[PDB]
């Protein structure tokens, strides 16, 4: 599961972007 | 515009900014085969290109490492693009959508500026990202489209 890990890493970034846009 | 159209237009536009003046044959081909109707100089594409570039700059190392492990570990590039897409989109946040679009545009830029990259790798990657990205159409439609998401909201 390198695909698993890439997925999760991108998901984390997606979450960071949301909070970022809220400020 | 579908997600596949906007992603392909962003990749074309990004190639014009970063590259050597020759669009990769793979991008020409996907334009021919998609019917790309959206101009890479359309204002919604320039605006998304800014947002995706900011995400790349802010995540530059993690984008490089994730791309490097993906591409060095895949035996079937286009299938694995569809697998990471599923991992992210399971259920659908704006941040997640953009993280995925920025990651794809970043991967295309990396593939297209490396003159040593084999054609088939560039080809299958651009096809894989475009096809996987279609999974966002239902969600973006419920938001009234990419243009509305940027101009607005």
* C-alpha to C-alpha distance for B60 and B106, rounded to whole angstroms: 9
* C-alpha to C-alpha distance for B17 and B13, rounded to whole angstroms: 7
Number of domains chain B is built from = 1
Q: For residue B49, what are the contacts with CB-CB under 8 A and spacing of at least 6? A: B10, B13, B14, B17, B105
Q: Quick one: tokens of B111?
A: 């593939």
Q: Which domain holds residue B10?
A: 1-153
Question: How was this model experimentally determined?
Answer: X-ray
Residue given tokens 């993280």 in the structure block: B99
CB contact, 8 Å: A22 with chain B? no
| B89/chain A closest Cα distance in angstroms | 9
Residue given tokens 């074309």 in the structure block: B12
CB-hemisphere CA count at 13 Å for A15? 7
Angle (CA) B25 B28 B34, round 5°: 135
- Selected for mutation to probe chain A from B62, B88, B98 (highest A CB count within 10 Å) is B88
The answer to whether residues B149 and B98 touch, using CB atoms and an 8 Å cutoff, is no
DSSP-assigned states of every residue in B101-112 = HHHHHHHHHHHH
Alpha helical stretches, state H, chain A: 2-21
Chain CA centroid to CA B3, Å: 9
**Biggest CA-to-CA distance, chain A:** 34
Angle (CA) B73 B11 B32, round 5°: 100
Q: How far is CA B69 from CA A7, A19, B3, B15, B80, in A?
A: 12, 27, 25, 23, 12
Report the candidate in B104, B112, B107 with the shortest Cα–Cα distance to residue B134.
B104
| B92/chain A closest Cα distance in angstroms | 10
Instruction: State the DSSP code for B42.
Output: S
Chain CA centroid to CA B87, Å: 17
CATH at B40: 1.10.437.10
* C-alpha to C-alpha distance for B54 and B31, rounded to whole angstroms: 25
Nearest CB to A6 within list B58, B69, B93: B69
The helix or strand, by DSSP H or E, that contains position B39, with its residue range, turns out to be: none
* C-alpha to C-alpha distance for A3 and A10, rounded to whole angstroms: 11
The answer to whether residues B79 and B129 touch, using CB atoms and an 8 Å cutoff, is no
The answer to whether residues B63 and B110 touch, using CB atoms and an 8 Å cutoff, is no
Resolution in A: 2.0
């Amino acid at each position: 599961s390198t695909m698993g890990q890439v997925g999760r890493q991108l998901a984390i970034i997606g979450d960071d972007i949301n909070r970022r846009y809220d400020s | 515009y579908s997600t596949r159209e906007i992603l392909l237009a962003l990749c074309i536009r990004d190639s014009r900014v970063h590259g050597n003046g020759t669009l990769h044959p793979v991008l020409e081909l996907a334009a021919r085969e998609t019917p790309l109707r959206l101009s890479p100089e359309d204002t919604v594409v320039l605006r998304y290109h800014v947002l995706l570039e900011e995400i790349i700059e802010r995540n530059s190392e993690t984008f490089t490492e994730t791309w490097n492990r993906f591409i060095t570990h895949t035996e079937h590039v286009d299938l694995d693009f569809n697998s990471v897409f599923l991992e992210i989109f399971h259920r659908p946040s704006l941040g997640r959508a953009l993280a995925w679009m920025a990651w794809c545009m970043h991967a295309c830029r990396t593939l297209c500026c490396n003159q040593s990259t084999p054609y088939y790798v560039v080809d299958l990657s651009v096809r894989g990202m475009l096809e996987a990205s279609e999974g966002l159409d239902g969600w973006i439609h419920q938001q009234g489209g990419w243009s509305t998401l940027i101009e607005d909201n």
